Amino acid sequence: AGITGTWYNQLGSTFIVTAGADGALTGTYESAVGNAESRYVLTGRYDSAPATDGSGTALGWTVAWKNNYRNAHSATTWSGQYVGGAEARINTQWLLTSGTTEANAXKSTLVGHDTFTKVK
Protein backbone atom coordinates (compact mmCIF):
# COMPACT_ATOMS: atom_id res chain seq x y z
CA ALA A 1 0.00 0.00 0.00
CA GLY A 2 2.70 2.38 1.17
CA ILE A 3 4.52 2.53 -2.21
CA THR A 4 1.43 3.39 -4.25
CA GLY A 5 1.22 7.09 -4.97
CA THR A 6 3.24 10.04 -6.01
CA TRP A 7 6.84 10.62 -5.22
CA TYR A 8 9.20 13.51 -5.73
CA ASN A 9 12.94 13.80 -5.92
CA GLN A 10 14.94 16.62 -4.80
CA LEU A 11 15.36 18.15 -8.32
CA GLY A 12 11.89 18.66 -9.74
CA SER A 13 10.97 15.14 -10.98
CA THR A 14 7.84 13.20 -10.10
CA PHE A 15 6.50 9.86 -10.51
CA ILE A 16 3.29 8.22 -9.93
CA VAL A 17 3.24 4.49 -9.26
CA THR A 18 0.77 1.72 -8.45
CA ALA A 19 2.14 -1.29 -6.56
CA GLY A 20 0.22 -4.40 -7.57
CA ALA A 21 -0.53 -7.14 -5.11
CA ASP A 22 1.89 -9.68 -6.68
CA GLY A 23 4.89 -7.44 -7.18
CA ALA A 24 4.17 -5.23 -10.20
CA LEU A 25 5.06 -1.52 -10.36
CA THR A 26 3.38 0.49 -13.06
CA GLY A 27 3.08 4.18 -13.60
CA THR A 28 4.37 7.43 -15.08
CA TYR A 29 7.60 9.37 -14.62
CA GLU A 30 7.58 13.16 -15.27
CA SER A 31 11.06 14.61 -15.59
CA ALA A 32 9.81 18.25 -15.05
CA VAL A 33 6.86 19.01 -12.68
CA GLY A 34 3.71 20.28 -14.36
CA ASN A 35 5.02 19.49 -17.91
CA ALA A 36 2.86 16.85 -19.73
CA GLU A 37 5.35 16.55 -22.66
CA SER A 38 7.82 15.25 -20.05
CA ARG A 39 5.73 12.12 -19.06
CA TYR A 40 7.07 8.59 -19.68
CA VAL A 41 5.93 5.08 -18.94
CA LEU A 42 7.53 3.41 -15.81
CA THR A 43 7.49 -0.31 -15.24
CA GLY A 44 9.17 -2.33 -12.45
CA ARG A 45 8.97 -4.77 -9.61
CA TYR A 46 9.02 -4.84 -5.85
CA ASP A 47 9.31 -7.51 -3.20
CA SER A 48 5.63 -7.95 -2.24
CA ALA A 49 6.39 -9.57 1.13
CA PRO A 50 9.17 -7.59 2.80
CA ALA A 51 10.53 -8.26 6.31
CA THR A 52 8.52 -7.22 9.37
CA ASP A 53 12.00 -6.49 10.96
CA GLY A 54 12.11 -2.65 10.35
CA SER A 55 13.88 -3.28 6.98
CA GLY A 56 13.07 -1.49 3.79
CA THR A 57 11.25 -3.04 0.85
CA ALA A 58 13.44 -3.67 -2.26
CA LEU A 59 12.22 -2.43 -5.60
CA GLY A 60 13.34 -1.29 -9.00
CA TRP A 61 11.96 0.28 -12.16
CA THR A 62 12.83 1.34 -15.69
CA VAL A 63 11.88 4.32 -17.85
CA ALA A 64 12.83 4.35 -21.54
CA TRP A 65 13.14 8.07 -22.46
CA LYS A 66 10.75 7.90 -25.37
CA ASN A 67 7.30 9.42 -25.56
CA ASN A 68 5.36 11.27 -28.27
CA TYR A 69 7.53 14.40 -27.79
CA ARG A 70 11.04 13.10 -27.19
CA ASN A 71 13.23 10.11 -28.02
CA ALA A 72 16.44 10.37 -26.14
CA HIS A 73 17.63 6.87 -27.23
CA SER A 74 18.21 6.08 -23.60
CA ALA A 75 16.76 4.25 -20.63
CA THR A 76 17.20 4.68 -16.92
CA THR A 77 16.85 2.02 -14.18
CA TRP A 78 16.46 2.80 -10.52
CA SER A 79 17.28 0.27 -7.80
CA GLY A 80 16.48 0.88 -4.18
CA GLN A 81 14.31 0.45 -1.17
CA TYR A 82 11.10 1.94 0.23
CA VAL A 83 11.10 2.92 3.95
CA GLY A 84 7.57 3.82 5.19
CA GLY A 85 6.44 5.95 8.21
CA ALA A 86 6.13 9.65 8.71
CA GLU A 87 9.24 10.60 6.71
CA ALA A 88 8.62 7.86 4.01
CA ARG A 89 11.26 7.68 1.36
CA ILE A 90 12.46 5.62 -1.58
CA ASN A 91 16.28 5.72 -1.60
CA THR A 92 17.74 4.71 -4.99
CA GLN A 93 20.72 4.54 -7.23
CA TRP A 94 20.19 4.81 -10.94
CA LEU A 95 21.95 3.77 -14.19
CA LEU A 96 21.24 5.71 -17.42
CA THR A 97 22.31 3.90 -20.61
CA SER A 98 22.36 5.55 -23.98
CA GLY A 99 22.40 3.68 -27.28
CA THR A 100 25.94 4.09 -28.64
CA THR A 101 28.23 2.92 -31.44
CA GLU A 102 30.58 0.16 -30.56
CA ALA A 103 33.45 2.64 -30.45
CA ASN A 104 31.59 4.84 -27.89
CA ALA A 105 30.24 1.94 -25.80
CA UNK A 106 32.55 2.84 -22.93
CA LYS A 107 30.72 6.16 -22.43
CA SER A 108 27.29 4.49 -22.57
CA THR A 109 26.26 4.42 -18.85
CA LEU A 110 25.91 7.24 -16.32
CA VAL A 111 25.37 6.52 -12.61
CA GLY A 112 23.76 8.55 -9.85
CA HIS A 113 21.44 8.54 -6.89
CA ASP A 114 17.97 9.88 -6.16
CA THR A 115 15.99 10.10 -2.92
CA PHE A 116 12.18 10.27 -3.34
CA THR A 117 9.75 11.51 -0.77
CA LYS A 118 6.03 12.06 -0.60
CA VAL A 119 6.20 15.95 -0.43
CA LYS A 120 7.84 18.32 -3.05
Added chain:
Amino acid sequence: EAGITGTWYNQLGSTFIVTAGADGALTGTYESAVGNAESRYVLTGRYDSAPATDGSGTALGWTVAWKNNYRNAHSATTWSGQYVGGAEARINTQWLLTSGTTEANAXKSTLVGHDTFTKVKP
Protein backbone atom coordinates in the same frame (compact mmCIF):
# COMPACT_ATOMS: atom_id res chain seq x y z
CA GLU B 1 12.85 -5.44 -31.65
CA ALA B 2 12.27 -8.63 -33.42
CA GLY B 3 15.92 -8.57 -32.40
CA ILE B 4 15.39 -8.39 -28.62
CA THR B 5 12.56 -10.89 -28.34
CA GLY B 6 13.77 -14.34 -27.32
CA THR B 7 16.12 -16.10 -24.98
CA TRP B 8 19.36 -14.75 -23.72
CA TYR B 9 22.19 -16.22 -21.70
CA ASN B 10 24.89 -14.71 -19.57
CA GLN B 11 28.20 -16.11 -19.14
CA LEU B 12 27.45 -17.69 -15.71
CA GLY B 13 24.48 -19.98 -16.23
CA SER B 14 21.57 -17.55 -16.11
CA THR B 15 18.93 -17.15 -18.73
CA PHE B 16 16.07 -15.01 -19.54
CA ILE B 17 13.29 -15.04 -21.90
CA VAL B 18 11.80 -11.72 -23.02
CA THR B 19 9.15 -10.36 -25.36
CA ALA B 20 9.66 -6.84 -26.69
CA GLY B 21 6.28 -5.15 -27.21
CA ALA B 22 5.75 -2.84 -30.11
CA ASP B 23 5.41 0.29 -27.87
CA GLY B 24 8.40 -0.29 -25.62
CA ALA B 25 7.38 -2.95 -23.08
CA LEU B 26 9.73 -5.78 -21.99
CA THR B 27 8.07 -8.69 -20.27
CA GLY B 28 9.35 -12.14 -19.48
CA THR B 29 11.05 -14.47 -17.04
CA TYR B 30 14.52 -14.65 -15.54
CA GLU B 31 15.97 -18.05 -14.46
CA SER B 32 19.00 -17.72 -12.23
CA ALA B 33 20.11 -21.36 -12.80
CA VAL B 34 19.61 -23.00 -16.30
CA GLY B 35 16.93 -25.68 -16.27
CA ASN B 36 15.88 -25.09 -12.61
CA ALA B 37 12.11 -24.27 -12.53
CA GLU B 38 12.27 -23.07 -8.85
CA SER B 39 14.68 -20.42 -9.99
CA ARG B 40 12.20 -18.54 -12.35
CA TYR B 41 11.18 -14.94 -11.64
CA VAL B 42 9.08 -12.31 -13.36
CA LEU B 43 11.04 -9.67 -15.42
CA THR B 44 9.57 -6.36 -16.54
CA GLY B 45 11.19 -3.43 -18.24
CA ARG B 46 11.33 -0.99 -21.10
CA TYR B 47 13.26 -0.39 -24.29
CA ASP B 48 13.52 2.45 -26.71
CA SER B 49 11.20 1.22 -29.53
CA ALA B 50 12.62 3.57 -32.20
CA PRO B 51 16.40 3.31 -31.91
CA ALA B 52 18.76 5.21 -34.29
CA THR B 53 19.15 4.10 -37.89
CA ASP B 54 22.91 3.82 -37.86
CA GLY B 55 24.56 0.81 -36.06
CA SER B 56 24.05 2.36 -32.58
CA GLY B 57 22.73 -0.02 -29.89
CA THR B 58 19.17 0.05 -28.55
CA ALA B 59 18.84 1.19 -24.90
CA LEU B 60 16.84 -0.93 -22.51
CA GLY B 61 16.44 -1.87 -18.90
CA TRP B 62 14.58 -4.33 -16.70
CA THR B 63 13.91 -5.35 -13.10
CA VAL B 64 13.56 -8.69 -11.35
CA ALA B 65 12.32 -8.77 -7.71
CA TRP B 66 13.85 -12.00 -6.28
CA LYS B 67 10.58 -13.39 -5.04
CA ASN B 68 8.74 -16.37 -6.46
CA ASN B 69 6.82 -19.30 -4.88
CA TYR B 70 10.11 -20.93 -3.72
CA ARG B 71 12.29 -18.04 -2.59
CA ASN B 72 12.01 -14.51 -1.21
CA ALA B 73 15.40 -12.97 -1.14
CA HIS B 74 14.11 -9.55 0.00
CA SER B 75 15.93 -7.97 -2.96
CA ALA B 76 15.56 -6.70 -6.49
CA THR B 77 18.03 -6.33 -9.35
CA THR B 78 17.86 -3.81 -12.23
CA TRP B 79 19.84 -4.15 -15.42
CA SER B 80 20.61 -1.19 -17.67
CA GLY B 81 22.22 -1.57 -21.06
CA GLN B 82 21.98 -1.80 -24.76
CA TYR B 83 21.10 -4.40 -27.41
CA VAL B 84 23.43 -4.73 -30.42
CA GLY B 85 21.95 -7.01 -33.16
CA GLY B 86 23.56 -9.02 -35.96
CA ALA B 87 25.91 -11.92 -36.16
CA GLU B 88 27.24 -11.88 -32.60
CA ALA B 89 24.03 -10.24 -31.03
CA ARG B 90 24.51 -9.16 -27.47
CA ILE B 91 22.88 -7.23 -24.66
CA ASN B 92 25.63 -5.51 -22.67
CA THR B 93 24.50 -4.41 -19.18
CA GLN B 94 25.40 -3.18 -15.80
CA TRP B 95 23.25 -4.18 -12.88
CA LEU B 96 22.34 -2.92 -9.38
CA LEU B 97 21.09 -5.38 -6.74
CA THR B 98 19.42 -3.76 -3.74
CA SER B 99 18.51 -5.65 -0.61
CA GLY B 100 15.96 -4.45 1.94
CA THR B 101 17.97 -3.35 4.95
CA THR B 102 17.62 -1.65 8.32
CA GLU B 103 18.54 2.03 8.39
CA ALA B 104 21.87 1.22 10.14
CA ASN B 105 22.83 -1.20 7.31
CA ALA B 106 21.52 0.93 4.44
CA UNK B 107 25.00 1.79 3.27
CA LYS B 108 25.52 -2.00 2.57
CA SER B 109 22.26 -2.19 0.57
CA THR B 110 23.37 -2.10 -3.12
CA LEU B 111 25.74 -4.36 -5.08
CA VAL B 112 26.92 -3.45 -8.57
CA GLY B 113 28.14 -5.56 -11.45
CA HIS B 114 28.02 -6.25 -15.15
CA ASP B 115 26.53 -8.98 -17.34
CA THR B 116 26.86 -9.65 -21.09
CA PHE B 117 24.01 -11.67 -22.63
CA THR B 118 24.23 -13.62 -25.87
CA LYS B 119 21.87 -15.73 -27.90
CA VAL B 120 23.88 -19.04 -27.38
CA LYS B 121 24.88 -20.73 -24.05
CA PRO B 122 28.31 -19.87 -22.67
